[PDB]
Design a binder for this molecule. Structure first.
Ligand SMILES: N[C@@]1(C(=O)O)CO[C@H]2[C@H](C(=O)O)[C@H]21
Lengths: 783, 762
């Protein structure tokens, strides 16, 4: 008997907590005016409209059987069965079951018979699970839509390093898990940390929460899914911790726009951003509802109780006049969920209007298919509704029966100190925010950002922090490297040095041997003195070519020797000149060649003297090769082989100029130089000295024998000293050329010692063998 | 239409397939005897037995309220409401028949958590207590039959097979388990078919025609369909069809699918829950009088379906169910367990709430099924009614309310009947001597296996078959196997490792490389030089001819120039290849110029002149010719370099070898037109002998020339190909060089050697 029946062809089921819980075994308490009877009447309000509406179920009466949950799952459930005991009225499909704790039981029972449910009030995600509540639907969004809005906002504020804070319990945990996973899925935001507030927090835990939030202190953003007191206590902790202006808060509808959680914490909460459910009142309902007196709603069997509590009066505390009107004789306002009670009723109405056009097309009353009116079909027709709801706001369901997310976005601001929440914008599965109208205590109108780290300068690398793509370690680039990518730089093989920003490389300066330097001036001078000294000598031998003193010297050999001395000097300074073919055609070849010829000709003269004694090991005849022509033939044989070694080496090591950065190489190229030289290998010294040093050894084998040789051969004395002397020069050479190879300085030492050695072999022969006689030749040609 | 109701000091209702599924109309089908009525009647006797039992709640007449499911879930769902309509309030559902009834009812009952214990729903679906937190069973999960099936298939090496399951959970949970168990034993399901709850006769044949698409899979697995006991009769057709059926406990020791449907060929295997018959329940059932059994409101209609004399007719029920043969349905033991189990949990619930009194209060009889389930049902310990001492059947529950996972294995035999051939209890045991497939006497054993299992050297090839069906083909000796679908390979020098996971760089051929063969033939060539030497070391003391100090010393030196050049170079050799060896060993095969001709050209120019003459003239001439020969062959390295220090025959890859081959015919271009005038010179020189020296050496020179030309030339018929193969190359080169040179020598040196060596006075 305790229920409302509206007669009709199609009977709608419905449920409201018209009472709260009773006690001591009684199921039903006080009347929930607003959550109960206000919603209940909104159901009948929409029901009357449906029956009156020419577009839905034409001339078919949507009756209803409506029920009172008393906010108890067992009482709500035991009366809900009556729809199935009637499988009495055909209860085709059902509205409501109010909040979640009751909606799980009505969702449990009605799916057992493939009967659909449309809740106007239950929000919990635990009903989005089609494996258990396949027949469930709601016309209100779940809590997880705030999480998407939160992710969207954190991105809108360009934050990427945030902390998430929430209470224990499904509200907090749901918001957090939806937030974290949606944040991960959208990207752009990394979470510095995730912290919970216990169902029973310990004293000081909130200060500990702040300290933990400060372990990642640049994570100035805090996301909250916690209740009013938890919010208040976090803010108190920030106050106590003096983090006012450091932390900025974001949070759920549990904060909403209530001033309650921020009282005496106004300065702490300022700038906080909260997500509020979007709703409007239905004006049509208030106009209707506010006109209902006892006699205008007698079909509602609980209306009398509503009157007794509404007006604080008794109908059988003051005796009631039975004339009081709500909104005049008692305050009245509409419950926001009235909006969804009406949309739930209409969504059923629309789905029934889909079974009508398909299974009973254009009829009045119910076709045979509509005698069962299979709720397995009504279920698809509900999920597929798409219509403007009572608020004008489209009513749809996703595949789990969830309505799209509709929220307002507010920021807590202090306007002349006033504790107000201002609208920044809104979210309708997408943001619309006037960010420029936002305020933050640590910045005023400027947007603070909760971020990982700071950008690197060109030439510095942003190395990803493992596990957090948003974050980086800034690692400067070094050595001879240049930037490649934001987190990469690489080396330039080189003869090129990095530029100042290390984002590119440029060329290393090259040196040649310039005639002002110590290593160019010494041999430049020596080559010039060489020729002047040489011509003093040559000139006396040429002008007195036919006199007794020149002839006595072995004029023919003296000519080859003197010519080779001159010729090597003539080009000595060129071997260190800026490299080109006019020098790379000479290399150590030409100078080496005159030196080698000088030694061979000294050897030929030496053999002319000492052959009479050495020949004795093989023959007892007159020294072979005595005629001057034959002495020249030896002079020539000894050297023509050098020309052949030269010809081969020329092909092996080509006549070209090279820049070798290696000779002045550094680890830091900004201090590096390179060197311009003719491209000549060390093997060229074997090609030369491998034989000229043997002419020497041969000469010294003979020179040491002077002790037993007749005085007309005293000309040997200076050949001997010359060769000993130049041996010493070449013994001095190897420790300088090779003994210095470990040092960069070889670039001038090697080239200098070589050009100088040429002048020395040449100068020593003149100084010992010719000049002591030139004085005499010049003034006494007959001696 | 009709319901069974009893008074009771407690009421513990039940639900059965008393009727089978009827037609499309909202009505019921014929009585199910075995799985229907016998089970129902067992419950009635079990209640009488518990009511009379002097230990089990003796102070109470327990009653029941028993529903007919009619095998339609909508009917069962509506009828089952009687248990909750009072919220009579009924203290726990026994049975619920087969799975989708038990599941839609264990679904139905959840709203109030009404307790439920089943004897015939087996699907794992109800093992998840997050959806069914009150529901217990006396039967094991169905995935144990999937193990049994896979194991039986694996037994007969049946690696490839076909199956049929139904819509409704028995199908999906059964087939998914069996597929995983099939995969776990390498069993390739050839195909699987899904049957509805209302499938036509033509569609039953359609499924058979689908199963006949690869007669090579002789085995066809049956997962209860909706209920095989009725429905398989429509598929076990004799219309040119046969299989070796393997069925779940929807079929087990039943005539109801073979009589008139011979497609259920001998050898079909049925898996049933392990059980025992009870003579006290059989006695009750077989003794029932259709006139007196008013407690069962269907028994008289069952009699009309079993006997043709309807209770509406005269002189009927003269027969009896004991007078005619019958069999006890296999699950009766589980039914009575489910009856006792519900009673035991409620005996302890009664004692727990009210131990001083006969009965529950009407405020207590809303027994919460989750309260009862977790604290009372799962803790029931009671031996199965009338159980023999040789079994272990009980009403004890597992942690999920599961029963006992032990099955019987029956084989369908002709003279038609069933016999137990084995069992399964986490492992398969068969006595195959009772199965027509043991020691086959009429052709081979049943085939249901797609390919041989592959060897580790073979790759999956030829046969996708239906699926998973691969033969494998061996990899080549030189190929390995990084994929069991395809053989891997490597370059020359690279050959399969024993693991077949990679390649080894092969060894060298090596033989007498490290222990270089070269030192032997080299030493033997040096014996020429030494024999020569000790002879020259005494010669004028023993064979006078003192021109030997000049002429003889230089003539021998001329030859050994050659001998040396020769052996020195060829024995730069194939030890340690590339290196100091590769550049200077072959040089276009120009070593016969080193010996025979160095020797002969110069000894010729020397004698020509004799018949500038000096020791130096002899040294100088041979050196000029040596430098000319040497320089033009080595000068081909102005173009070329040492290389080809790696090859092998693809037709081997047994070893690597390191043979240099630097445009050899182009390198022969160093000399290719000229050596024939050296041969002609030789032939002239042969002719010029006008002044024969002491011992007539001019004759020995002519003799040399003739035979030497030969010995030398003789090598190239050997070398030109066989120089490619180690043992012949090495042996023939070593001896060739040694020998040919020795001919040159022996020919002119032997007189001087043997004269002094054997007659030192001469
Ligand atoms: N599986 C059933 C049973 O016998 O237990 C339940 O549904 C009727 C179901 C079907 O055919 O789909 C038989």
């Amino acid at each position: 008997m305790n229920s409302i029946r509206i007669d009709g062809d199609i009977t709608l089921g419905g449920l409201f907590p018209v009472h709260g819980r009773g006690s001591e075994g009684k199921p039903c308490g006080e009347l929930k005016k607003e959550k109960g009877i206000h919603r209940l009447e909104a159901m009948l309000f929409a029901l009357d409209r449906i029956n009156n509406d020419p577009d839905l179920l034409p001339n078919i009466t949507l009756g209803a059987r409506i029920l009172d949950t008393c906010s108890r799952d067992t009482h709500a459930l035991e009366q809900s069965l009556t729809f199935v005991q009637a499988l009495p009225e055909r209860v085709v499909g059902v509205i409501g079951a109010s909040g979640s704790s009751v909606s799980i039981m009505v969702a449990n029972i009605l799916r057992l018979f493939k009967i659909p449910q449309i809740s106007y009030a239950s929000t919990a995600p635990d009903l989005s699970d089609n494996s258990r509540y396949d027949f469930f639907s709601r016309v209100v969004p779940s809590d997880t839509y705030q999480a998407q809005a939160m992710v969207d906002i954190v991105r809108a504020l360009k934050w990427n390093y945030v902390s998430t804070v929430a209470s224990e319990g499904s509200y907090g945990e749901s918001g957090v898990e939806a937030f974290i996973q949606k944040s991960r899925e959208d990207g752009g935001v990394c979470i510095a940390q995730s912290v919970k507030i216990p169902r029973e927090p310990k004293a000081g835990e909130f200060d500990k929460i702040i300290r933990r939030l400060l372990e990642t202190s640049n994570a100035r953003a805090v996301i909250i899914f916690a209740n009013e007191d938890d919010i208040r206590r976090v803010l108190e902790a920030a106050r106590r911790a003096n983090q006012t202006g450091h932390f900025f808060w974001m949070g759920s509808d549990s904060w909403g726009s209530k001033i309650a959680p921020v009282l005496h914490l106004e300065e702490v909460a300022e700038g906080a951003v909260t997500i509020l459910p979007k709703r409007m009142s239905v004006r049509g309902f208030d106009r209707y509802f506010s006109s209902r007196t006892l006699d205008n709603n007698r079909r509602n069997i609980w209306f009398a109780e509503f009157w007794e509590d509404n007006f604080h009066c008794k109908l059988s505390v003051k005796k009631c006049t039975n004339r009081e009107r709500i909104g005049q004789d008692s305050a009245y306002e509409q419950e926001g969920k009235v909006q969804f009670v009406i949309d739930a009723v209409y969504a059923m109405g629309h789905a029934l209007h889909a079974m009508h056009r398909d299974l009973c097309p254009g009829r009045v009353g119910l076709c045979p298919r509509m005698d069962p009116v299979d709720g397995t079909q009504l279920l698809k027709y509900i999920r597929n509704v798409n219509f403007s709801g009572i608020a004008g706001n489209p009513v749809t369901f996703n595949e789990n029966g969830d309505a799209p997310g509709r929220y307002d976005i507010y920021q807590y601001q202090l306007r002349n100190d006033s504790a107000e929440y201002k609208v920044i914008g809104s979210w309708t599965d997408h943001l619309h925010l006037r960010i420029e109208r936002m305020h933050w205590p640590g910045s005023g109108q400027q947007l603070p950002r909760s971020i990982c780290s700071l950008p690197c300068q060109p030439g510095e690398r942003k190395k990803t922090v493992k596990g957090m793509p948003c974050c980086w370690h800034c690692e400067p680039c070094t050595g001879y490297q240049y930037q490649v990518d934001r987190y990469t730089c690489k080396t330039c093989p080189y003869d090129m040095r990095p530029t100042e920003n290390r984002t590119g490389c440029r060329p290393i300066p090259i040196i040649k041997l310039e005639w002002g330097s110590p290593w160019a001036v010494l041999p430049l001078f020596l080559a010039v003195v060489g020729i002047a000294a040489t011509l003093f000598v040559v000139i006396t031998f040429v002008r007195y070519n036919d006199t007794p003193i020149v002839k006595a010297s072995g004029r023919e050999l003296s000519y080859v020797l003197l010519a080779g001395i001159f010729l090597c000097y003539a080009t000595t300074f060129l071997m260190i000149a800026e490299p080109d073919l006019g020098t790379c055609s000479l290399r150590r070849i030409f100078l080496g060649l005159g030196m080698s010829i000088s030694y061979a000709a000294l050897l030929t003269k030496t053999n002319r003297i000492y052959r009479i004694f050495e020949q004795g090991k093989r023959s007892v005849s007159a020294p072979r090769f005595i005629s001057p022509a034959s002495q020249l033939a030896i002079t020539f044989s000894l050297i023509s082989l050098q020309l052949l070694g030269i010809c081969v080496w020329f092909v092996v090591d080509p006549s070209h100029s090279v820049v070798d950065f290696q000779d002045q190489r550094t680890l830091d190229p900004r201090f590096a130089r390179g060197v311009l030289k003719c491209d000549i290998s060390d093997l060229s010294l074997i090609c030369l000295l491998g034989y000229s040093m043997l002419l020497m050894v041969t000469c010294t084998v003979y020179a040491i024998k002077t002790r037993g040789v007749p005085e007309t051969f005293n000309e040997a004395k200076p050949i001997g000293f010359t060769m000993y002397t130049t041996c010493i020069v070449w013994l001095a050479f190897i420790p300088i050329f090779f003994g210095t190879s470990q040092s960069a300085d070889k670039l001038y030492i090697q080239t200098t010692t070589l050009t100088v050695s040429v002048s020395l072999s040449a100068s020593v022969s003149l100084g010992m063998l010719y000049m002591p006689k030139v004085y005499i030749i010049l003034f006494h040609p007959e001696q | 239409k009709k319901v069974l109701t009893l008074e009771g000091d407690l009421v513990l209702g039940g639900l059965f397939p008393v009727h089978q599924k009827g037609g499309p109309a909202e009505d019921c089908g014929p009585v199910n005897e075995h799985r229907g009525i016998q089970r129902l009647e067992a419950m009635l006797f079990a209640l009488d037995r518990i009511n009379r039992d002097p230990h089990l709640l003796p102070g109470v007449r327990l009653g029941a309220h028993i529903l007919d499911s009619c095998s339609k879930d909508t009917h069962a769902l509506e009828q089952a409401l009687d248990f909750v309509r009072a919220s009579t309030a009924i203290t726990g559902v026994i049975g619920g028949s087969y799975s989708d009834v038990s599941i839609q009812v264990a679904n139905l009952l959840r709203l109030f958590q009404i307790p439920q214990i089943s004897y015939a729903s087996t699907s794992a679906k109800l093992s998840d207590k997050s959806r069914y937190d009150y529901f217990a069973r006396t039967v094991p999960p169905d995935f144990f039959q999937a193990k049994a099936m896979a194991e039986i298939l694996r037994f007969f090496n049946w690696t490839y097979v076909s199956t049929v399951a139904s819509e409704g959970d028995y199908g999906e949970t059964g087939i998914e388990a069996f597929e995983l168990e099939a995969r776990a034993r390498n069993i390739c399901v050839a195909t699987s078919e899904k049957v509805g709850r209302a499938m036509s006769r033509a569609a039953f044949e359609g499924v058979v025609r689908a199963l006949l698409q690869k007669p090579s899979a002789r085995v066809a697995v049956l997962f209860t369909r909706s209920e095989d006991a009725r429905e398989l009769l429509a598929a076990s057709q004799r219309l040119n069809a046969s299989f070796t059926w393997v069925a779940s406990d929807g079929w087990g020791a039943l005539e109801s699918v073979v009589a008139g449907s011979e497609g259920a060929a001998e050898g079909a295997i049925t898996i049933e829950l392990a059980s025992y018959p009870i003579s006290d329940f059989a006695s009750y059932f077989q003794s029932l009088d259709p006139w007196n059994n008013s407690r069962n409101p269907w028994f008289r209609e069952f009699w009309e379906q079993r006997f043709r004399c309807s209770f509406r007719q005269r002189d009927c029920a003269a027969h009896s169910l004991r007078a005619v043969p019958f069999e006890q349905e296999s699950k009766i033991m589980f039914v009575v367990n489910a009856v006792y189990a519900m009673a035991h949990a409620l005996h302890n619930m009664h004692r727990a709430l009210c131990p001083n009194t006969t009965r529950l209060c009407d405020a207590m009889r809303p027994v919460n099924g989750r309260r009862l389930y977790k604290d009372f049902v799962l803790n029931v310990k009671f031996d199965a009614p009338f159980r023999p001492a040789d079994t272990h059947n009980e009403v004890r529950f597992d942690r999920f309310g599961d029963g006992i996972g032990r099955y019987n294995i029956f084989t369908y035999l002709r003279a038609y009947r069933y016999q137990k051939v084995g069992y399964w209890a986490e492992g398969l045991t068969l006595d195959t001597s009772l199965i027509p497939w043991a020691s086959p006497s009429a052709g081979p054993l049943p085939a249901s296996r797609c390919s041989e299992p592959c060897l580790q050297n073979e790759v999956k090839s030829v046969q996708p078959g239906e699926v998973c069906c691969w033969l494998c083909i061996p990899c080549q000796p030189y190929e390995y196997r990084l994929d069991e679908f395809t053989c891997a390979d490597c370059g020359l020098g690279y050959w399969p490792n024993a693991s077949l996971t990679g390649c080894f760089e092969l060894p060298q051929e090596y033989i007498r490389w490290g222990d270089a063969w070269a030192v032997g033939p080299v030493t033997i060539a040096c014996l020429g030089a030494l024999a020569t030497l000790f002879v020259l070391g005494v010669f004028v003391r023993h064979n006078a001819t003192p021109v030997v100090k000049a002429s003889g010393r230089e003539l021998c030196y001329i030859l050994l120039g050659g001998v040396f050049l020769c052996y020195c170079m060829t024995f730069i050799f194939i030890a340690k290849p590339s290196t100091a060896v590769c550049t200077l060993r072959r040089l276009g095969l120009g070593t016969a110029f080193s010996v025979c001709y160095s020797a002969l050209l110069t000894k010729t120019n020397r004698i020509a002149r004799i018949f500038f003459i000096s020791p130096a003239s002899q040294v100088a001439i041979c050196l000029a010719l040596i430098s000319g020969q040497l320089l033009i062959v080595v000068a081909w390295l102005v173009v070329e370099a040492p290389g080809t220090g790696k090859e092998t025959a693809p037709e081997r890859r047994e070893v690597v070898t390191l043979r240099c081959n630097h445009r050899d015919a182009s390198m022969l271009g160093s000399l290719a037109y000229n050596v024939l005038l050296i041969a002609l010179c030789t032939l002239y020189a042969f002719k010029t002998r006008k002044c024969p020296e002491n011992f007539n050496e001019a004759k020995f020179i002519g003799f040399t020339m003739y035979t030497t030309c030969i010995i030398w030339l003789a090598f190239l018929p050997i070398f030109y190909v066989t120089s490619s193969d180690y043992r012949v190359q090495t042996t023939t080169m070593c001896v060739s060089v040694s020998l040919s040179g020795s001919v040159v020598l022996g020919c002119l040196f032997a007189p001087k050697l043997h004269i002094i060596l054997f007659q030192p006075q001469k």
